[PDB]
């Protein structure tokens, strides 16, 4: 017999990714700011590193897109789904997609994008969603307006029971 | 915290079902027959129970369709690709698509829908095809009218399940 295997993780700590797109609401700057400060908030507490690519195929392809935009799983507009990630693994596996009928931002007005991104690896990562209501990987939306970012200790806890620690 | 399980499987053991549309070939009540029995072939052999329901929104949607009916994997007329249905998962993970260029039976004739649903919702539950020609995974059309799962399949679909009551 065969099952579908998945990967729970990535075999190799050295990933790449590509910023595909970008939204309208922030500048190139900023998006690319938002993704780096989320990647960097699993690469600071694991062995995981991460690397950007300008052209071609990397493990975590990141783009915004609306209603059906090329895996079957549609945005819905404004408001309800703000993204979603794939699991670990080839092809579509790690690749993260942010619904652009949200407005992004680099602040308060709209939905964070640093924030949703940070949530979104951790999938692109193998962490599912955590029922602890303090976590970053909390299936709810909530900016706390602080400067400074501290990943919650439940999120510590899940990804490196998968990566261990650096 | 949660991470992602090993493999693509149901995380729960109560799932939904619903008939979408119908086939010309054959009576809403043979059709329903044929899923429910097909269903029975998983449930039997591990602790899965399936309900169906009449509309809005299931786990399992099942559907039958031609050519290009809504995903990657579009239909190809009579024969060949006989239906496909998606590993567990959101929206559509788990549905099930036949072929309506197909003819679909509740016979010896054509092509027997409980057999190849029973194939199908194995891949809703997540099983992929088998190596085993006497398996009911084998990805190759062979009717029977007797039903008793191989155990190739049996082991397979336990390693995701368990057995439930061994009965
Ligand atoms: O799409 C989403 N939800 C709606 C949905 C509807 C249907 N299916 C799936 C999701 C969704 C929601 C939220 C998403 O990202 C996020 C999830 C959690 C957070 C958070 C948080 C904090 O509480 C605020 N501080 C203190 C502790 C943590 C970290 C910093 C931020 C974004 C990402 C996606
Ligand atoms: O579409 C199909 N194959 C063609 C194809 C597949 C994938 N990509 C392209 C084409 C296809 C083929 C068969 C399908 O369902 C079936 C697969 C196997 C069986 C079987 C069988 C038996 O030997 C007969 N008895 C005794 C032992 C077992 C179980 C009961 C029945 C239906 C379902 C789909
Ligand atoms: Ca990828
Ligand atoms: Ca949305
Ligand atoms: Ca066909
Ligand atoms: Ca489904
Ligand atoms: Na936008
Ligand atoms: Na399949
Ligand atoms: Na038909
Ligand atoms: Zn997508
Ligand atoms: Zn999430
Ligand atoms: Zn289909
Ligand atoms: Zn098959």
């Known amino acids: 017999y065969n099952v579908f295997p998945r990967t729970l993780k990535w075999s190799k700590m050295n990933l790449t990714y590509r910023i595909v797109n ?41 783009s915004f897109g609306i209603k059906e935009h090329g895996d079957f799983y549609p945005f819905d507009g404004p408001s309800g789904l703000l993204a979603h990630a794939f699991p670990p693994g080839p092809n579509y596996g790690g690749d993260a997609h942010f619904d652009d009928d949200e407005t992004w931002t680099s602040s308060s007005k709209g939905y964070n994008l640093f ?14 969603h955590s029922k602890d209501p303090g976590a970053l990987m909390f299936p709810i939306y909530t900016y706390t307006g ?6 919650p200790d439940d999120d510590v806890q899940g990804i490196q029971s998968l990566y261990g620690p650096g």
């Open 115 to 128: 924030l949703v991104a940070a949530h979104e690896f951790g999938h692109s990562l193998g962490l599912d």
């Open 146 to 151: 602080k400067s400074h970012f501290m990943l």
């Open 22 to 62: 970008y939204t309208p609401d922030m500048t190139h700057s900023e998006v690319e700011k938002a993704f780096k400060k989320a990647f960097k908030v699993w690469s600071d507490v694991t062995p995981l590193n991460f690397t950007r690519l300008h052209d071609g195929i990397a493990d975590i392809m990141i």
